[PDB]
mmCIF file with all atom_site columns, C-alpha atoms in Angstrom:
data_model
loop_
_atom_site.group_PDB
_atom_site.id
_atom_site.type_symbol
_atom_site.label_atom_id
_atom_site.label_alt_id
_atom_site.label_comp_id
_atom_site.label_asym_id
_atom_site.label_entity_id
_atom_site.label_seq_id
_atom_site.pdbx_PDB_ins_code
_atom_site.Cartn_x
_atom_site.Cartn_y
_atom_site.Cartn_z
_atom_site.occupancy
_atom_site.B_iso_or_equiv
_atom_site.pdbx_formal_charge
_atom_site.auth_seq_id
_atom_site.auth_comp_id
_atom_site.auth_asym_id
_atom_site.auth_atom_id
_atom_site.pdbx_PDB_model_num
ATOM 1   C CA . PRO A 1 1  ? 0.000   0.000   0.000   1.00 0.00 ? 28  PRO A CA 1
ATOM 2   C CA . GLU A 1 2  ? 1.601   3.270   -1.223  1.00 0.00 ? 29  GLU A CA 1
ATOM 3   C CA . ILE A 1 3  ? 1.788   5.937   1.498   1.00 0.00 ? 30  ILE A CA 1
ATOM 4   C CA . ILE A 1 4  ? 2.509   9.591   0.775   1.00 0.00 ? 31  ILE A CA 1
ATOM 5   C CA . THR A 1 5  ? 2.597   12.903  2.619   1.00 0.00 ? 32  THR A CA 1
ATOM 6   C CA . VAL A 1 6  ? 0.459   15.751  1.277   1.00 0.00 ? 33  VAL A CA 1
ATOM 7   C CA . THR A 1 7  ? 0.738   19.275  2.623   1.00 0.00 ? 34  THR A CA 1
ATOM 8   C CA . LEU A 1 8  ? -2.045  21.748  1.799   1.00 0.00 ? 35  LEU A CA 1
ATOM 9   C CA . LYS A 1 9  ? -2.652  25.504  2.103   1.00 0.00 ? 36  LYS A CA 1
ATOM 10  C CA . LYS A 1 10 ? -6.312  25.583  3.165   1.00 0.00 ? 37  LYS A CA 1
ATOM 11  C CA . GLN A 1 11 ? -8.356  27.797  0.905   1.00 0.00 ? 38  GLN A CA 1
ATOM 12  C CA . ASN A 1 12 ? -11.764 27.389  2.451   1.00 0.00 ? 39  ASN A CA 1
ATOM 13  C CA . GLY A 1 13 ? -11.103 24.018  4.028   1.00 0.00 ? 40  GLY A CA 1
ATOM 14  C CA . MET A 1 14 ? -9.093  21.344  2.202   1.00 0.00 ? 41  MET A CA 1
ATOM 15  C CA . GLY A 1 15 ? -11.805 20.991  -0.488  1.00 0.00 ? 42  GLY A CA 1
ATOM 16  C CA . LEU A 1 16 ? -12.545 17.423  0.587   1.00 0.00 ? 43  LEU A CA 1
ATOM 17  C CA . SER A 1 17 ? -15.677 15.461  1.326   1.00 0.00 ? 44  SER A CA 1
ATOM 18  C CA . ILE A 1 18 ? -14.894 12.543  3.638   1.00 0.00 ? 45  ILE A CA 1
ATOM 19  C CA . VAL A 1 19 ? -16.545 9.477   5.144   1.00 0.00 ? 46  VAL A CA 1
ATOM 20  C CA . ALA A 1 20 ? -15.902 7.006   7.952   1.00 0.00 ? 47  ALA A CA 1
ATOM 21  C CA . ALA A 1 21 ? -15.787 3.447   6.599   1.00 0.00 ? 48  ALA A CA 1
ATOM 22  C CA . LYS A 1 22 ? -14.210 0.027   7.062   1.00 0.00 ? 49  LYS A CA 1
ATOM 23  C CA . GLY A 1 23 ? -11.973 -1.272  4.299   1.00 0.00 ? 50  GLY A CA 1
ATOM 24  C CA . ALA A 1 24 ? -13.244 -4.655  3.160   1.00 0.00 ? 51  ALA A CA 1
ATOM 25  C CA . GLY A 1 25 ? -9.968  -6.142  4.398   1.00 0.00 ? 52  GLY A CA 1
ATOM 26  C CA . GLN A 1 26 ? -9.898  -4.142  7.627   1.00 0.00 ? 53  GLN A CA 1
ATOM 27  C CA . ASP A 1 27 ? -11.644 -4.388  11.008  1.00 0.00 ? 54  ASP A CA 1
ATOM 28  C CA . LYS A 1 28 ? -10.272 -0.929  11.917  1.00 0.00 ? 55  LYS A CA 1
ATOM 29  C CA . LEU A 1 29 ? -12.593 1.968   11.024  1.00 0.00 ? 56  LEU A CA 1
ATOM 30  C CA . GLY A 1 30 ? -10.992 4.573   8.728   1.00 0.00 ? 57  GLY A CA 1
ATOM 31  C CA . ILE A 1 31 ? -11.314 8.057   7.239   1.00 0.00 ? 58  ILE A CA 1
ATOM 32  C CA . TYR A 1 32 ? -11.572 7.985   3.450   1.00 0.00 ? 59  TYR A CA 1
ATOM 33  C CA . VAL A 1 33 ? -11.887 10.617  0.712   1.00 0.00 ? 60  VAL A CA 1
ATOM 34  C CA . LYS A 1 34 ? -15.402 10.206  -0.606  1.00 0.00 ? 61  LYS A CA 1
ATOM 35  C CA . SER A 1 35 ? -14.885 12.929  -3.260  1.00 0.00 ? 62  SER A CA 1
ATOM 36  C CA . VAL A 1 36 ? -12.743 16.026  -4.047  1.00 0.00 ? 63  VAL A CA 1
ATOM 37  C CA . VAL A 1 37 ? -14.202 19.510  -4.652  1.00 0.00 ? 64  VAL A CA 1
ATOM 38  C CA . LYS A 1 38 ? -13.164 20.855  -8.046  1.00 0.00 ? 65  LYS A CA 1
ATOM 39  C CA . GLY A 1 39 ? -11.095 24.015  -7.576  1.00 0.00 ? 66  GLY A CA 1
ATOM 40  C CA . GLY A 1 40 ? -10.444 23.336  -3.883  1.00 0.00 ? 67  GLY A CA 1
ATOM 41  C CA . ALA A 1 41 ? -7.002  23.039  -2.222  1.00 0.00 ? 68  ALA A CA 1
ATOM 42  C CA . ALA A 1 42 ? -6.696  19.242  -2.610  1.00 0.00 ? 69  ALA A CA 1
ATOM 43  C CA . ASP A 1 43 ? -7.881  19.456  -6.231  1.00 0.00 ? 70  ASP A CA 1
ATOM 44  C CA . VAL A 1 44 ? -5.254  22.070  -7.163  1.00 0.00 ? 71  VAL A CA 1
ATOM 45  C CA . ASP A 1 45 ? -2.591  20.072  -5.331  1.00 0.00 ? 72  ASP A CA 1
ATOM 46  C CA . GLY A 1 46 ? -3.681  17.257  -7.652  1.00 0.00 ? 73  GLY A CA 1
ATOM 47  C CA . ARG A 1 47 ? -2.522  14.278  -5.538  1.00 0.00 ? 74  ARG A CA 1
ATOM 48  C CA . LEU A 1 48 ? -5.612  13.319  -3.431  1.00 0.00 ? 75  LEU A CA 1
ATOM 49  C CA . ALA A 1 49 ? -8.484  11.286  -4.946  1.00 0.00 ? 76  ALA A CA 1
ATOM 50  C CA . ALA A 1 50 ? -11.763 9.513   -4.064  1.00 0.00 ? 77  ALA A CA 1
ATOM 51  C CA . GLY A 1 51 ? -10.973 6.242   -2.255  1.00 0.00 ? 78  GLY A CA 1
ATOM 52  C CA . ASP A 1 52 ? -7.747  7.384   -0.592  1.00 0.00 ? 79  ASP A CA 1
ATOM 53  C CA . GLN A 1 53 ? -7.506  6.697   3.094   1.00 0.00 ? 80  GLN A CA 1
ATOM 54  C CA . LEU A 1 54 ? -6.492  9.511   5.417   1.00 0.00 ? 81  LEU A CA 1
ATOM 55  C CA . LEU A 1 55 ? -4.099  7.855   7.877   1.00 0.00 ? 82  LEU A CA 1
ATOM 56  C CA . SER A 1 56 ? -3.000  10.827  9.986   1.00 0.00 ? 83  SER A CA 1
ATOM 57  C CA . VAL A 1 57 ? -3.738  14.540  10.289  1.00 0.00 ? 84  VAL A CA 1
ATOM 58  C CA . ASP A 1 58 ? -0.847  16.782  11.499  1.00 0.00 ? 85  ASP A CA 1
ATOM 59  C CA . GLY A 1 59 ? 0.986   13.669  12.753  1.00 0.00 ? 86  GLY A CA 1
ATOM 60  C CA . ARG A 1 60 ? -1.993  12.433  14.788  1.00 0.00 ? 87  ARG A CA 1
ATOM 61  C CA . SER A 1 61 ? -3.567  9.150   13.583  1.00 0.00 ? 88  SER A CA 1
ATOM 62  C CA . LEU A 1 62 ? -7.158  9.042   12.291  1.00 0.00 ? 89  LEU A CA 1
ATOM 63  C CA . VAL A 1 63 ? -7.246  5.236   12.156  1.00 0.00 ? 90  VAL A CA 1
ATOM 64  C CA . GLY A 1 64 ? -9.764  3.391   14.393  1.00 0.00 ? 91  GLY A CA 1
ATOM 65  C CA . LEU A 1 65 ? -11.305 6.514   15.949  1.00 0.00 ? 92  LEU A CA 1
ATOM 66  C CA . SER A 1 66 ? -14.899 7.473   16.759  1.00 0.00 ? 93  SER A CA 1
ATOM 67  C CA . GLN A 1 67 ? -16.518 9.957   14.338  1.00 0.00 ? 94  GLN A CA 1
ATOM 68  C CA . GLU A 1 68 ? -16.543 12.490  17.218  1.00 0.00 ? 95  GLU A CA 1
ATOM 69  C CA . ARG A 1 69 ? -12.770 12.102  17.865  1.00 0.00 ? 96  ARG A CA 1
ATOM 70  C CA . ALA A 1 70 ? -11.938 12.491  14.155  1.00 0.00 ? 97  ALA A CA 1
ATOM 71  C CA . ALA A 1 71 ? -14.221 15.522  13.609  1.00 0.00 ? 98  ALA A CA 1
ATOM 72  C CA . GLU A 1 72 ? -12.574 17.215  16.595  1.00 0.00 ? 99  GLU A CA 1
ATOM 73  C CA . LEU A 1 73 ? -9.181  16.558  14.984  1.00 0.00 ? 100 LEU A CA 1
ATOM 74  C CA . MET A 1 74 ? -10.226 18.069  11.655  1.00 0.00 ? 101 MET A CA 1
ATOM 75  C CA . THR A 1 75 ? -11.643 21.280  13.188  1.00 0.00 ? 102 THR A CA 1
ATOM 76  C CA . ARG A 1 76 ? -8.341  21.843  15.043  1.00 0.00 ? 103 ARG A CA 1
ATOM 77  C CA . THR A 1 77 ? -6.215  22.009  11.848  1.00 0.00 ? 104 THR A CA 1
ATOM 78  C CA . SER A 1 78 ? -4.206  25.156  11.002  1.00 0.00 ? 105 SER A CA 1
ATOM 79  C CA . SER A 1 79 ? -4.289  27.161  7.753   1.00 0.00 ? 106 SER A CA 1
ATOM 80  C CA . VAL A 1 80 ? -1.733  24.515  6.835   1.00 0.00 ? 107 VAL A CA 1
ATOM 81  C CA . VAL A 1 81 ? -2.375  20.774  7.191   1.00 0.00 ? 108 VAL A CA 1
ATOM 82  C CA . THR A 1 82 ? -0.116  17.783  6.580   1.00 0.00 ? 109 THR A CA 1
ATOM 83  C CA . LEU A 1 83 ? -1.857  14.497  5.809   1.00 0.00 ? 110 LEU A CA 1
ATOM 84  C CA . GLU A 1 84 ? -0.442  11.003  5.583   1.00 0.00 ? 111 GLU A CA 1
ATOM 85  C CA . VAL A 1 85 ? -2.534  9.299   2.937   1.00 0.00 ? 112 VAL A CA 1
ATOM 86  C CA . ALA A 1 86 ? -2.712  5.659   1.931   1.00 0.00 ? 113 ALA A CA 1
ATOM 87  C CA . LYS A 1 87 ? -3.231  5.785   -1.852  1.00 0.00 ? 114 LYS A CA 1
ATOM 88  C CA . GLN A 1 88 ? -6.093  3.518   -3.040  1.00 0.00 ? 115 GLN A CA 1
ATOM 89  C CA . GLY A 1 89 ? -4.487  0.410   -4.503  1.00 0.00 ? 116 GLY A CA 1
ATOM 90  C CA . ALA A 1 90 ? -5.063  -0.893  -8.011  1.00 0.00 ? 117 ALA A CA 1
ATOM 91  C CA . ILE A 1 91 ? -4.992  -4.413  -6.594  1.00 0.00 ? 118 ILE A CA 1
ATOM 92  C CA . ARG A 1 92 ? -7.267  -4.139  -3.584  1.00 0.00 ? 119 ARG A CA 1
ATOM 93  C CA . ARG A 1 93 ? -9.533  -6.099  -1.304  1.00 0.00 ? 120 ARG A CA 1
ATOM 94  C CA . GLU A 1 94 ? -13.260 -5.579  -1.877  1.00 0.00 ? 121 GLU A CA 1
ATOM 95  C CA . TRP A 1 95 ? -16.590 -6.998  -0.771  1.00 0.00 ? 122 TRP A CA 1
ATOM 96  C CA . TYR A 1 96 ? -18.973 -8.642  -3.225  1.00 0.00 ? 123 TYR A CA 1
ATOM 97  C CA . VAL A 1 97 ? -22.484 -9.806  -2.714  1.00 0.00 ? 124 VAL A CA 1
ATOM 98  C CA . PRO B 1 1  ? -35.576 9.365   3.241   1.00 0.00 ? 24  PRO B CA 1
ATOM 99  C CA . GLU B 1 2  ? -37.239 7.224   0.519   1.00 0.00 ? 25  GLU B CA 1
ATOM 100 C CA . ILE B 1 3  ? -37.369 3.520   1.420   1.00 0.00 ? 26  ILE B CA 1
ATOM 101 C CA . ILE B 1 4  ? -38.141 0.797   -1.106  1.00 0.00 ? 27  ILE B CA 1
ATOM 102 C CA . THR B 1 5  ? -38.203 -2.990  -1.292  1.00 0.00 ? 28  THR B CA 1
ATOM 103 C CA . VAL B 1 6  ? -36.129 -4.678  -4.000  1.00 0.00 ? 29  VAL B CA 1
ATOM 104 C CA . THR B 1 7  ? -36.398 -8.383  -4.715  1.00 0.00 ? 30  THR B CA 1
ATOM 105 C CA . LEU B 1 8  ? -33.661 -10.022 -6.804  1.00 0.00 ? 31  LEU B CA 1
ATOM 106 C CA . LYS B 1 9  ? -33.076 -13.364 -8.551  1.00 0.00 ? 32  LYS B CA 1
ATOM 107 C CA . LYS B 1 10 ? -29.388 -13.963 -7.800  1.00 0.00 ? 33  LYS B CA 1
ATOM 108 C CA . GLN B 1 11 ? -27.429 -14.628 -10.947 1.00 0.00 ? 34  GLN B CA 1
ATOM 109 C CA . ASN B 1 12 ? -23.974 -15.072 -9.519  1.00 0.00 ? 35  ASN B CA 1
ATOM 110 C CA . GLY B 1 13 ? -24.561 -13.052 -6.378  1.00 0.00 ? 36  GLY B CA 1
ATOM 111 C CA . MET B 1 14 ? -26.601 -9.833  -6.453  1.00 0.00 ? 37  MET B CA 1
ATOM 112 C CA . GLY B 1 15 ? -23.966 -8.088  -8.626  1.00 0.00 ? 38  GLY B CA 1
ATOM 113 C CA . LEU B 1 16 ? -23.165 -5.624  -5.847  1.00 0.00 ? 39  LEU B CA 1
ATOM 114 C CA . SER B 1 17 ? -19.996 -4.323  -4.273  1.00 0.00 ? 40  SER B CA 1
ATOM 115 C CA . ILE B 1 18 ? -20.688 -3.078  -0.745  1.00 0.00 ? 41  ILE B CA 1
ATOM 116 C CA . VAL B 1 19 ? -18.969 -1.261  2.107   1.00 0.00 ? 42  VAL B CA 1
ATOM 117 C CA . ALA B 1 20 ? -19.509 -0.656  5.814   1.00 0.00 ? 43  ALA B CA 1
ATOM 118 C CA . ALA B 1 21 ? -19.634 3.078   6.554   1.00 0.00 ? 44  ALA B CA 1
ATOM 119 C CA . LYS B 1 22 ? -21.168 5.722   8.802   1.00 0.00 ? 45  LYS B CA 1
ATOM 120 C CA . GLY B 1 23 ? -23.473 8.268   7.212   1.00 0.00 ? 46  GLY B CA 1
ATOM 121 C CA . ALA B 1 24 ? -22.208 11.751  8.000   1.00 0.00 ? 47  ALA B CA 1
ATOM 122 C CA . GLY B 1 25 ? -25.434 12.330  9.932   1.00 0.00 ? 48  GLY B CA 1
ATOM 123 C CA . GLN B 1 26 ? -25.427 8.924   11.613  1.00 0.00 ? 49  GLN B CA 1
ATOM 124 C CA . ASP B 1 27 ? -23.582 7.358   14.560  1.00 0.00 ? 50  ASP B CA 1
ATOM 125 C CA . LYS B 1 28 ? -24.955 3.931   13.540  1.00 0.00 ? 51  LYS B CA 1
ATOM 126 C CA . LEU B 1 29 ? -22.686 1.964   11.182  1.00 0.00 ? 52  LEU B CA 1
ATOM 127 C CA . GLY B 1 30 ? -24.374 0.957   7.903   1.00 0.00 ? 53  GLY B CA 1
ATOM 128 C CA . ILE B 1 31 ? -24.124 -1.209  4.786   1.00 0.00 ? 54  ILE B CA 1
ATOM 129 C CA . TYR B 1 32 ? -23.976 0.861   1.604   1.00 0.00 ? 55  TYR B CA 1
ATOM 130 C CA . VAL B 1 33 ? -23.763 0.079   -2.120  1.00 0.00 ? 56  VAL B CA 1
ATOM 131 C CA . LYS B 1 34 ? -20.284 1.154   -3.122  1.00 0.00 ? 57  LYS B CA 1
ATOM 132 C CA . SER B 1 35 ? -20.900 0.245   -6.799  1.00 0.00 ? 58  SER B CA 1
ATOM 133 C CA . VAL B 1 36 ? -23.089 -1.984  -9.043  1.00 0.00 ? 59  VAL B CA 1
ATOM 134 C CA . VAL B 1 37 ? -21.678 -4.607  -11.442 1.00 0.00 ? 60  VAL B CA 1
ATOM 135 C CA . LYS B 1 38 ? -22.825 -3.961  -15.001 1.00 0.00 ? 61  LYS B CA 1
ATOM 136 C CA . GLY B 1 39 ? -24.906 -6.907  -16.215 1.00 0.00 ? 62  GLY B CA 1
ATOM 137 C CA . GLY B 1 40 ? -25.444 -8.292  -12.706 1.00 0.00 ? 63  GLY B CA 1
ATOM 138 C CA . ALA B 1 41 ? -28.834 -8.947  -11.041 1.00 0.00 ? 64  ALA B CA 1
ATOM 139 C CA . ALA B 1 42 ? -29.119 -5.523  -9.352  1.00 0.00 ? 65  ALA B CA 1
ATOM 140 C CA . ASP B 1 43 ? -28.041 -3.778  -12.569 1.00 0.00 ? 66  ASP B CA 1
ATOM 141 C CA . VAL B 1 44 ? -30.716 -5.524  -14.667 1.00 0.00 ? 67  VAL B CA 1
ATOM 142 C CA . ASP B 1 45 ? -33.308 -4.821  -11.979 1.00 0.00 ? 68  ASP B CA 1
ATOM 143 C CA . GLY B 1 46 ? -32.263 -1.195  -12.488 1.00 0.00 ? 69  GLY B CA 1
ATOM 144 C CA . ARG B 1 47 ? -33.335 0.203   -9.085  1.00 0.00 ? 70  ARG B CA 1
ATOM 145 C CA . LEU B 1 48 ? -30.177 -0.072  -6.881  1.00 0.00 ? 71  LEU B CA 1
ATOM 146 C CA . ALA B 1 49 ? -27.333 2.478   -7.173  1.00 0.00 ? 72  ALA B CA 1
ATOM 147 C CA . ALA B 1 50 ? -24.016 3.543   -5.581  1.00 0.00 ? 73  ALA B CA 1
ATOM 148 C CA . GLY B 1 51 ? -24.726 5.353   -2.294  1.00 0.00 ? 74  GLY B CA 1
ATOM 149 C CA . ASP B 1 52 ? -27.911 3.478   -1.394  1.00 0.00 ? 75  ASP B CA 1
ATOM 150 C CA . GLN B 1 53 ? -28.040 2.108   2.102   1.00 0.00 ? 76  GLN B CA 1
ATOM 151 C CA . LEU B 1 54 ? -29.009 -1.517  2.611   1.00 0.00 ? 77  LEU B CA 1
ATOM 152 C CA . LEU B 1 55 ? -31.316 -1.434  5.644   1.00 0.00 ? 78  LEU B CA 1
ATOM 153 C CA . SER B 1 56 ? -32.378 -5.082  5.891   1.00 0.00 ? 79  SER B CA 1
ATOM 154 C CA . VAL B 1 57 ? -31.663 -8.386  4.162   1.00 0.00 ? 80  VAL B CA 1
ATOM 155 C CA . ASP B 1 58 ? -34.536 -10.953 4.084   1.00 0.00 ? 81  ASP B CA 1
ATOM 156 C CA . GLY B 1 59 ? -36.305 -8.991  6.848   1.00 0.00 ? 82  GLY B CA 1
ATOM 157 C CA . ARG B 1 60 ? -33.258 -8.994  9.142   1.00 0.00 ? 83  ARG B CA 1
ATOM 158 C CA . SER B 1 61 ? -31.692 -5.558  9.812   1.00 0.00 ? 84  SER B CA 1
ATOM 159 C CA . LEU B 1 62 ? -28.140 -4.753  8.669   1.00 0.00 ? 85  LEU B CA 1
ATOM 160 C CA . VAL B 1 63 ? -28.024 -1.451  10.567  1.00 0.00 ? 86  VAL B CA 1
ATOM 161 C CA . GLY B 1 64 ? -25.428 -1.049  13.367  1.00 0.00 ? 87  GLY B CA 1
ATOM 162 C CA . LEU B 1 65 ? -23.868 -4.510  12.989  1.00 0.00 ? 88  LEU B CA 1
ATOM 163 C CA . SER B 1 66 ? -20.259 -5.722  13.064  1.00 0.00 ? 89  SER B CA 1
ATOM 164 C CA . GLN B 1 67 ? -18.733 -6.534  9.649   1.00 0.00 ? 90  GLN B CA 1
ATOM 165 C CA . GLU B 1 68 ? -18.644 -10.208 10.750  1.00 0.00 ? 91  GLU B CA 1
ATOM 166 C CA . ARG B 1 69 ? -22.394 -10.252 11.614  1.00 0.00 ? 92  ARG B CA 1
ATOM 167 C CA . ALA B 1 70 ? -23.337 -8.625  8.286   1.00 0.00 ? 93  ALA B CA 1
ATOM 168 C CA . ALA B 1 71 ? -21.096 -10.889 6.152   1.00 0.00 ? 94  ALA B CA 1
ATOM 169 C CA . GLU B 1 72 ? -22.670 -13.919 7.836   1.00 0.00 ? 95  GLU B CA 1
ATOM 170 C CA . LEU B 1 73 ? -26.102 -12.538 6.916   1.00 0.00 ? 96  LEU B CA 1
ATOM 171 C CA . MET B 1 74 ? -25.167 -12.049 3.263   1.00 0.00 ? 97  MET B CA 1
ATOM 172 C CA . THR B 1 75 ? -23.733 -15.573 2.822   1.00 0.00 ? 98  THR B CA 1
ATOM 173 C CA . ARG B 1 76 ? -26.984 -17.060 4.193   1.00 0.00 ? 99  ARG B CA 1
ATOM 174 C CA . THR B 1 77 ? -29.204 -15.527 1.457   1.00 0.00 ? 100 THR B CA 1
ATOM 175 C CA . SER B 1 78 ? -31.262 -17.766 -0.867  1.00 0.00 ? 101 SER B CA 1
ATOM 176 C CA . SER B 1 79 ? -31.290 -17.747 -4.685  1.00 0.00 ? 102 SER B CA 1
ATOM 177 C CA . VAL B 1 80 ? -33.850 -15.037 -3.990  1.00 0.00 ? 103 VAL B CA 1
ATOM 178 C CA . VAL B 1 81 ? -33.166 -12.046 -1.726  1.00 0.00 ? 104 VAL B CA 1
ATOM 179 C CA . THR B 1 82 ? -35.417 -9.204  -0.595  1.00 0.00 ? 105 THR B CA 1
ATOM 180 C CA . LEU B 1 83 ? -33.672 -5.994  0.440   1.00 0.00 ? 106 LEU B CA 1
ATOM 181 C CA . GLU B 1 84 ? -35.064 -2.922  2.139   1.00 0.00 ? 107 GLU B CA 1
ATOM 182 C CA . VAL B 1 85 ? -33.035 -0.059  0.736   1.00 0.00 ? 108 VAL B CA 1
ATOM 183 C CA . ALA B 1 86 ? -32.856 3.564   1.804   1.00 0.00 ? 109 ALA B CA 1
ATOM 184 C CA . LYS B 1 87 ? -32.449 5.464   -1.485  1.00 0.00 ? 110 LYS B CA 1
ATOM 185 C CA . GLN B 1 88 ? -29.603 8.040   -1.376  1.00 0.00 ? 111 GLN B CA 1
ATOM 186 C CA . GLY B 1 89 ? -31.226 11.438  -0.924  1.00 0.00 ? 112 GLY B CA 1
ATOM 187 C CA . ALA B 1 90 ? -30.741 14.405  -3.226  1.00 0.00 ? 113 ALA B CA 1
ATOM 188 C CA . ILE B 1 91 ? -30.741 16.641  -0.160  1.00 0.00 ? 114 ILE B CA 1
ATOM 189 C CA . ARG B 1 92 ? -28.382 14.833  2.182   1.00 0.00 ? 115 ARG B CA 1
ATOM 190 C CA . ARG B 1 93 ? -26.035 15.308  5.087   1.00 0.00 ? 116 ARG B CA 1
ATOM 191 C CA . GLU B 1 94 ? -22.331 15.201  4.218   1.00 0.00 ? 117 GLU B CA 1
ATOM 192 C CA . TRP B 1 95 ? -18.958 15.848  5.810   1.00 0.00 ? 118 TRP B CA 1
ATOM 193 C CA . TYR B 1 96 ? -16.634 18.562  4.530   1.00 0.00 ? 119 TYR B CA 1
ATOM 194 C CA . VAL B 1 97 ? -13.099 19.308  5.478   1.00 0.00 ? 120 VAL B CA 1
#
């Protein structure tokens, strides 16, 4: 799983719409990019994309946390935010029914 | 929130790729349609779509359950399955960052 570090200058927010989900593989709850806002900070930066997992915010992990704990952590971010992101794999575990 | 009942004749499975997530509004974990397989049972039926929440399977609720409990419930389904689905709203709660 490819992991990268993305640093953003917040325009109005990071220009990101997120969701709490469990990876089909995982038992640990995670924060994922549901979609990117065109023309927002993450869009212009050009790295982040729907499906990417947000591992940490400002060095503090987002993995396995309550939706309350994670929301608190997002509201506390500076004008500048550094994310560790697990890039969505080409070869990936998924759940079929 | 519009709720409907969809009954499917399983071809090879329902032709559905699902995910466990929390609605931005919700604290209850849910089963959602991540994507539909073209040419699968749900596709041909034409009702189900990415974003829809799967409320119950065969009359048994999928809301708020462990990923183990839900997977067990999906593997137990007959050649015929009846789902209660909460259609993804146009006006909906979402989580921006």
